[PDB]
Symmetry: D2
Subunit: 726 residues, 4 copies
C-alpha cells in the first residue's frame, strides 16, 4: 500500500495551529461541526476509501496507467472508452470565472441574532435569538482573475448567503461603505477602466495604470471610494480583520407594513487591521494565496472568523434630513450621525470540502431578498438586480443554478418552472401552469402576512417622468472624501499620500496625473500638495485657492472611519516568528511559548535549513521553515531568544529577516545576547519604543511584546525606517 506505515499522511480531525498538520477538506478535518446546510449536502458528498476506481458509468477500471493500443508500442485505439471519458472530463473542467470578484475564498458558518427584531422587520431569520441560520460566505478581491494574488491593493467583497426558513437572502457587500459610481449604467465603463487594458491585458490585480486614473479624473463621483482604496483599507491583513458593508440603503418592513431605511454593517470581532504597502506587494510574490490560506488555517485552528451584523436605521420621515442623498451609494452615513445597532453574530467554522463545487459554483445575488426586506431606488442597486440573474445563466450553464448543491435553499421550494439545461428536479405535478384545476391549483400563492407570508413590495409612491437623468442631489463629490481624510490618523494620512503617489507614478500620460492632482486639491490642499510634491508637480495659484468642501452635517471627522484611531486590537490567531540558533536557551523558549499559548497566538520556529536544532538542555526543536523560506511578511512579530547568538549573528538571511520586520513596523523582541542584532536595525543602546529587550525572556518581556501585538504595528517607527536599506 502507498500510505506510510506510521499514518503521517492523514491530518488529525481535531483543531490544530497553522503548520502543524496538512490541511484537509472540511468534513474530514471537522466531521462533527454541523449545521442544517452542511447536513443537507450529505446527499451529494462522495467518499473514496475502500471503493473501486470506476468510469462515471460505474465500470471498474483495471489499468488506469495506460491507453489501449495495437501492440505495446502501437497506435492508440478509438475504442478506448475509458481513456476518452477520463480525458473528455478533464478537457471540460473549466467554467467561466466571475466577471468581477473572480478571486475569492469561502467558508461555512452560522448566524444568530441577539434579540427579536419583529418590531422593525418581519424577516423570519431575525425573529428570535434562538433561530440559527446557516451561512456560506465568500470574500474576494474585485479586479484580478481567479488565479491572481490575494494581498493586492483593491476593494474586497464580503458576500453572505443566509439559508433562511423563508428563502435564501444574499447580503452581497464590500469592505468599504460606498462604491465608486452612482448609476449601474456606468458599471461596464468603470470595470473596463480598472481591469487589464484591452490591447495587452496588463496589469493584473492593480488599479495603478492609465485607464483607471483617466476614468477617475473624468468622473469625480469615484473619488470617495478611490480615497478608501488608496488608504490601508485597500490592503487588509486578513479577511478576519476588515469591515463589511451592504453600501446601499435598503428597507426593513415590519408586520404592520412600516418601512425603515437600513444600511448593513459587519464589524470584525478580531478588530480592524491592515498591512503596509511594501509588505502587501512583497507578499503577492512570496504567497499570492496568503488570505485564502489565512482564512482556511484560522478555521482549522478554531480561530473562527466572527462578525457582528449591525444596522444603521433611519426612519422614513428622515429621508431628507442629511446633506447627502441616502440613495447615493458614493455617500456614507457617518456613525456619529446614525449609530450602528448590533443585531447578531456570524461565526465561520468550517471550510468546504471541494473548492470548485462549493466556492467556484456558489452564486450570490443582492436581489435574493425575503419578506421583511425590500429595495430602494438607489440607481446602482437597481441595476445590480438585473445583472446577477443574467450572468449566472452563462457562468453556471443555465437557469437551474439553484439546483447546484451549495446554492440550494434548505426551505421548501415549489413552482411551475420546468426544464432547462441539467434539470435535476423531476416534477410530479400534473400541472405546469396556474391557475389550474387539475392539481387543485397547487402549489398556491400565499397572501403577505406577519410570518410565512408571500412577498409583496412596499408600496412606495413613484412620481416623475421617464428620464435618463442623474439626480441633482447626487452631484457633490468632495465632502465625503474630505471627511474620510480628516478622520484618519497622521500615519494613515501618510499612507494615503503614498498610495496616490505610487499609483500615479505608474500612469504613463502625465496629463492624467495632473488632472488627478487637480481633483485632490478640491478635497484637501495638504493631501494635494503632498501628492504633487512626490510627482514633481507644482500647484497653481488657482489650485492653492480652491475653497474646501463643506463639513457633513457639521462633522469635521468621525473616528469610526479610521482603522486605528480607536483601539480594537485582538491578538488571538496572530503568528510570531521565533528565530532559532543551534544552542537555544530552552528557558527563554518555554517562557515564550507559554505566554503566546495563553493568548492564542501561534508560533513558527525558523532556522538556516530544515531539520532540528537541540536546545542547551537537550530539548529537540523541530524547525518549521528557513529564514528565507518563511519571510517576516507572513508573521505579526519576531522574537529572537538567547543561546548561541554567535551562530546566526552573521547570517545574511537572519539579519534581513529583522530589517524587513522592522521596516514593516512589526514588534520585535530581543533576549540576552540577541541584543547583538540591535546593530543591524540601528537601535540606540538605551532602546526604542517597539523593540522589546531584556536579559532573558521572563514574564514581563512577554507582556510588553503582547501589548505591542495588540496595537498591531509600531507607527512611531515610521520616521526611522527610511535609513535602513531593506
Amino acid at each position: 500500500s502507498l500510505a506510510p506505515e506510521d499514518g503521517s499522511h492523514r491530518p488529525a480531525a481535531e483543531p490544530t495551529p497553522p503548520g502543524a498538520q496538512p490541511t484537509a477538506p472540511g468534513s474530514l478535518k471537522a466531521p462533527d461541526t454541523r449545521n442544517e446546510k452542511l447536513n443537507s449536502l450529505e446527499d451529494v458528498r462522495k467518499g473514496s476509501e475502500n471503493y473501486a476506481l470506476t468510469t462515471n458509468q460505474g465500470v471498474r477500471i483495471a489499468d488506469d496507467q495506460n491507453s489501449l493500443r495495437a501492440g505495446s508500442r502501437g497506435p492508440t485505439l478509438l475504442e478506448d472508452f475509458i481513456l476518452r471519458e477520463k480525458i473528455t472530463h478533464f478537457d471540460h473542467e473549466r467554467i467561466p470565472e466571475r466577471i468581477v470578484h473572480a478571486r475569492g475564498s469561502a467558508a461555512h458558518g452560522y448566524f444568530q441574532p441577539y434579540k427579536s427584531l419583529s418590531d422593525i422587520t418581519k424577516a423570519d431569520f431575525l425573529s428570535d435569538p434562538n433561530k440559527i441560520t446557516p451561512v456560506f460566505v465568500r470574500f474576494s478581491t474585485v479586479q484580478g482573475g481567479a488565479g491572481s494574488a490575494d494581498t493586492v491593493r483593491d476593494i474586497r467583497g464580503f458576500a453572505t448567503k443566509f439559508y433562511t426558513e423563508e428563502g435564501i437572502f444574499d447580503l452581497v457587500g464590500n469592505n468599504t461603505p460606498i462604491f465608486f459610481i452612482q448609476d449601474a449604467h456606468k458599471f461596464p465603463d468603470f470595470v473596463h477602466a480598472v481591469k487589464p487594458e484591452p490591447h495587452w491585458a496588463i496589469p493584473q490585480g492593480q488599479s495603478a495604470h492609465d485607464t483607471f486614473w483617466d476614468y477617475v479624473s473624468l468622473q469625480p463621483e469615484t473619488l470617495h471610494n478611490v480615497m478608501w482604496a488608496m488608504s490601508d483599507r485597500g490592503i487588509p491583513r486578513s479577511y478576519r480583520t476588515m469591515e463589511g458593508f451592504g453600501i446601499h440603503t435598503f428597507r426593513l418592513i415590519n408586520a404592520e407594513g412600516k418601512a425603515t431605511f437600513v444600511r448593513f454593517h459587519w464589524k470584525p470581532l478580531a478588530g480592524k487591521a491592515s498591512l503596509v504597502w511594501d509588505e502587501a506587494q512583497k507578499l503577492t510574490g512570496r504567497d499570492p494565496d496568503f488570505h485564502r490560506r489565512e482564512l482556511w488555517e484560522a478555521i482549522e485552528a478554531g480561530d473562527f472568523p466572527e462578525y457582528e451584523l449591525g444596522f444603521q436605521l433611519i426612519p422614513e420621515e428622515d429621508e431628507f434630513k442629511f446633506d447627502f442623498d441616502l440613495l447615493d451609494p458614493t455617500k456614507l452615513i457617518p456613525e456619529e450621525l446614525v449609530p450602528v445597532q448590533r443585531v447578531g453574530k456570524m461565526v465561520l467554522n468550517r471550510n468546504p470540502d471541494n473548492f470548485f463545487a462549493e466556492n467556484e459554483q456558489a452564486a450570490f445575488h443582492p436581489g435574493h431578498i425575503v419578506p421583511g426586506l425590500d429595495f430602494t431606488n438607489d440607481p446602482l442597486l437597481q441595476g445590480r438586480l438585473f445583472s446577477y440573474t443574467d450572468t449566472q445563466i452563462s457562468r453556471l450553464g443555465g437557469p437551474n443554478f439553484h439546483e447546484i448543491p451549495i446554492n440550494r435553499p434548505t426551505c421548501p421550494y415549489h413552482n411551475f418552472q420546468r426544464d432547462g439545461m441539467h434539470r435535476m428536479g423531476i416534477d410530479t405535478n400534473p400541472a405546469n401552469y396556474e391557475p389550474n384545476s387539475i392539481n387543485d391549483n397547487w402549489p398556491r400563492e400565499t397572501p403577505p402576512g406577519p410570518k410565512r407570508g408571500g412577498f409583496e413590495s412596499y408600496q412606495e409612491r413613484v412620481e416623475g417622468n421617464k428620464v435618463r437623468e442623474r439626480s441633482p442631489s447626487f452631484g457633490e463629490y468632495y465632502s465625503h472624501p474630505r471627511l474620510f481624510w480628516l478622520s484618519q490618523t497622521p500615519f494613515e494620512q501618510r499612507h494615503i499620500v503614498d498610495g496616490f503617489s505610487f499609483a500615479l507614478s505608474k500612469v504613463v500620460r502625465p496629463y492624467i496625473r495632473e488632472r488627478v492632482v487637480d481633483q485632490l486639491a478640491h478635497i484637501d490642499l495638504t493631501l494635494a500638495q503632498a501628492v504633487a510634491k512626490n510627482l514633481g508637480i507644482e500647484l497653481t495659484d488657482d489650485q492653492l485657492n480652491i475653497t474646501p468642501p463643506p463639513d457633513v452635517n457639521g462633522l469635521k471627522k468621525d473616528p469610526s472611519l479610521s482603522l486605528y484611531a480607536i483601539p480594537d486590537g485582538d491578538v488571538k490567531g496572530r503568528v510570531v516568528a521565533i528565530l532559532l540558533n543551534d544552542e537555544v536557551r530552552s528557558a527563554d523558549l518555554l517562557a515564550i511559548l507559554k505566554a503566546l499559548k495563553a493568548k492564542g497566538v501561534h508560533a513558527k520556529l525558523l532556522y538556516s535549513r530544515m531539520g532540528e536544532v537541540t536546545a542547551d538542555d537537550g530539548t529537540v526543536l523541530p524547525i518549521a521553515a528557513t529564514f528565507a523560506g518563511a519571510p517576516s511578511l507572513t508573521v505579526d512579530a519576531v522574537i529572537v531568544p538567547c543561546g548561541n547568538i554567535a551562530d546566526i549573528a552573521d547570517n545574511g538571511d537572519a539579519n534581513y529577516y529583522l530589517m524587513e520586520a522592522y521596516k514593516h513596523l512589526k514588534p520585535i523582541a530581543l533576549a540576552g545576547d540577541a541584543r547583538k542584532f540591535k546593530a543591524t536595525i540601528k537601535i540606540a543602546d538605551q532602546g526604542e519604543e517597539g523593540i522589546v529587550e531584556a536579559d532573558s525572556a521572563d514574564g514581563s518581556f512577554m507582556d510588553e511584546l503582547l501589548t505591542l501585538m495588540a496595537a498591531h504595528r509600531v507607527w512611531s517607527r515610521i520616521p526611522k525606517i527610511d535609513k535602513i536599506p531593506a
Copy 2:
C-alpha cells in the same frame, strides 16, 4: 380551490384502459410499481400538493398574476425579481435536440435472464435468473425533429439502458438488423442526405426527396436497409410490435477469457405488426403522437410492452465461414444459418413522471459496456464509440451528464475526475490523482476476474498497415437485398414496390429515379419492372439481362425476415371502434363488449356528437369520440351493432369511417340491420372473407371477429380496394 367537488379531475391510481381516465405522471398513476432505479430517483422527485408557490430561492409568492409596476397602468420595474426569475427560467427551457433520433418515447421497466449465461459471458446482469436489472427504454424515429410525427416511414431506434451492478450497459439498436452504411466516416454524408435539404429545410420526417435517393443511387451499400425501410417494416403499428437489433457483431467474454461473437435481438412478445402506407401517412396528420400515446396508454392499462432478448452466437473459429463479413453492418446473419438463442425478458411497466427530465435528458451510448462484453472492428461501431460521448458534451451542457438523475448508475462510481459545468458530486477525497499516498491510493484499480473485476479488453490480434481503405469483403451490395425481397409474402412485396414507387415519384430530377431503377435491376428483375412500370420507365435490354446476385450461403429465402409469413398475432391491447346509433340493441353491445374485455381488447364508443346515447332497454351509453374525432386510422377493427341504423346510415362520416377501414384492410363486423352498410363498401350478398356479418352479435360473431384481429389485416382484400374511392 378550483378542482371539481366530485374529484373528477384526478385519474384513478389503478390500471385503466385507453381513454377511460386522463393520463398522468407514472409515480401518480402507478405508485406501487417499483424498481431499484425508480426508487433511487426519489431524492429528486418533487411533489406539489399542499405546498406554497415560491421562487427558486424558496421565497413565497403572493401575486403570481402581475408584474410590479409604478401604478396599475404604469411601466414594469427592473426590481421585479419574481417576474425576471420566472421569465428567465422560461427563456432558457430548451436544450439542443438529439442530432438524430430526436423524436422518441420512453418508459421504465425491468429485465431478467431465463438462466445463468456464465459459460459464455461474465456480465453480471446475465449471471443469475433471480437477478433483476432495471431498464429505461427509448424508442424513436431517425430523421425528424423532436416535434415531428410518429408514424412516418423511417427506421426506428430501440435503446435500452440497463442499470447493472457492474455499470450501466446501453444496448443502442434499431428495428432492422442492418444499417445503411459501412464506415462511420460516411455517417454525416448519409444523415445530411436523408435530413431536410439545407437551402429550405424540407422535408420533415420523409426520405422521399432528391438528396436521399441521389446518395442511395451512388452508394449501393445502402440498398439493403433501404429495402427494409420501403417495406412495411418502415411503418410499425406500435413500438410493441416491432423487432429490435443491435446490428453489429459484438463479443461476449467469459471468465476463462473465451470470446464468442454475438449479435443482439429483441423479439416482441406481442408479435410483429405494421400499418399500411396510406393509413400511416394519414395518421401523421390526424395523430402525430400516435406511437408515443399508444406506448404510454398500454402501460397505463397494464398491457406492458414485453420483449425477449436473444443472441445469435458464432464461435471465433467460424468468423470467415459465411459469404458476407460478420463485421459488415450492411449484412444480416440469417436465422436459418445461426438461430437466435433466447436469453431473457424485458417488461416496460411504468411511464416517466416528467418527459423532459427523464426522456429528453437521457443519454444512451453503445460504448457503455460492462465486463463480459467487448467490441469488434466493425468500422461503423468503431466510429459510434467516438460520437456519443462527444455529442452529449453540448446537448447536455458539459461532462457531468452522468449526474443528471435518469443517467446515474445505481451501482457505486468513484474516480479522480473533478469539476465541469453543473458539478453535483462534492468529493471529499484529499487526492484528485493516482497514484497517491495521501489517501492510500483510493479509489483503487481492480484486476479482471470472474465477477466484480476491472474491465480489460479482449487481446485481439491486430495486423496491417495504417490505411483508409474499405475491406474487399465488404464490397457486395445486392445479395442481402435479394434475400430480403424473396422472403416477403406476395402482399409484402407489393407494399415494397409501392414504397419505392411513391418515394421515387417525389424525386424531382428524373435521372435519379432512373439510376435507382437500375440499382433495383441488380437485386431482382420482377421488383425493378414493377417499380419502373409505376414510374413510366422502361427497362433496357441490358437491364433485363443483369444476372441476379448469388444466394446467401445457399438460402433463397428466410421466413424470419417477413413480418407476416409465420403468424405471430396477439390481440391483447388492440382497439375496436364501435359505431353507435341513437337506439342500439343493448344485447349486441353486451355480447360485443364482454368478448373484447375477455381477450384484453379495448373499445371506443363513437357517435356523431359527444355526450350520451340511450340503448333500446334504457342503458345510458357514454360516447368517447365522434366519427371524425377518432377516425378508423386509430383502431384495429370496426364493429357496427344493430339498432336504429337509419340514424347513421346517411351520415357521410359513418360511411367514410367504414370505407377507410375497409381500404386499410381492417376487419369489419356488421350485426343486424348494420348489414345495410354492405352497399357502402360494395360487399356481395353472399359476404366476403374479412367482413363478419350475422343477424345479431351472438353465437360465433365475436369469435370470428377476434380471429380476424389475430391475423392483423385482411390481405386477401387488396385486389378489391381499388374499386373504392377513399
Copy 3:
C-alpha cells in the same frame, strides 16, 4: 474634447524604446507592418474615431451616463433596452480559460525557410526559400490561471500557428525537450497533482506542494522533466531567451513517400538566459506581468523576437 491640446495622449506610431510612450494596439502602433494573415483580419477590425456610440443594433445613444427611471430619483424601468444590452454583454464577457496553459502572451510574425526541403518533406511551407508563412505565436506557463504571474517556476509553452497555403499547421511545443509523463491516460492525474489542491485551491503558479511531489515520488518517469523544471530553465528571463521543442518524434514525408523521423527545435537568436530564483519570486510580486510586458515592449521597440 477630453484629450489634451498637446496630443500627448496618443503614442507615436513608430518604434520607441520601453517606457518612452504608452503602449498601444498593434495596428495603431505599427500600421505599416503587414503579412497575409494580418491583411485577412482587416474585415473584422473595428475603429472608433469620429463614430457615434451605438447599441449593437446600430441605434445611436444620447445619454450613456444614466439608466431610464421614473423621475430622477425613481426606480429603473424594465424598458431600458440600452442599459440591459450593455449590462448583458458585460455579464457574459468571460469564457472558460484553457485547462492548462491558461496564462499566456502572443504576437503575430512570419516564418521563411532558408532553402527548399523538398528532398525530405512535401510540406508546402518548407518548399521555397521565397515562401513567407504568417504565424501567430503564444507563449505560456502551464499550471496557473490566466490571472497568475509570469515569472513562476514552471515549464513554458511555445505554440506556433503557421497559416500555410495547404492548411494550418500548429507546432504546439514547450521550452524543455521532454515531458513529465509517458502516456496521455495519465495527463489528468499529473495535471491534478501539480494544480492547486482540490480542497482549498492553493497554491497558484507553484509546483512546491505535497500532491505534486507525492505524484513525482510515485512516478519516476517524471524525474527527467522535474530536473529541468528545478534548474534555471524553470525561470526564463524572457520568452525571447528560452528554447522551444516539439518533444515528440513526428514524421516528415517526401513526394516519393519516404518517412524520416523528426524532432522539432526553436533556437532563440537572442540566446539562452534565465533569472535567478529569488529574483523570479520577487518579480511575481512586483510585476506579475513581466514576460507579457517584455514581449510586447520588445516588439514596439523593434527588438523583434527571432527564432530559428
Copy 4:
C-alpha cells in the same frame, strides 16, 4: 444568450446591422469584431472620448425616451380597466 450561445448574436451574419455600430462592449463567446480602440470605457481621454454620444434631434440623433409622466405606487395589480 442561450439559444445563440452568448452576447455576440448580433455578429451572426443575418442579425448584423448594415449601418455603423461602435461602442465600448468587448469580449464574450465567439467574438468576431477585433476592436482597435485604445479605450474600452467612456468617458476617456485616451481616444478623445470616441465613439461619442449624440444628442437627440430631427435626424441622425441619439435615442431619448419620450418623457411620459409616471404616477402611482409600486404595485402588482391589474388595471381595473382591463377587467
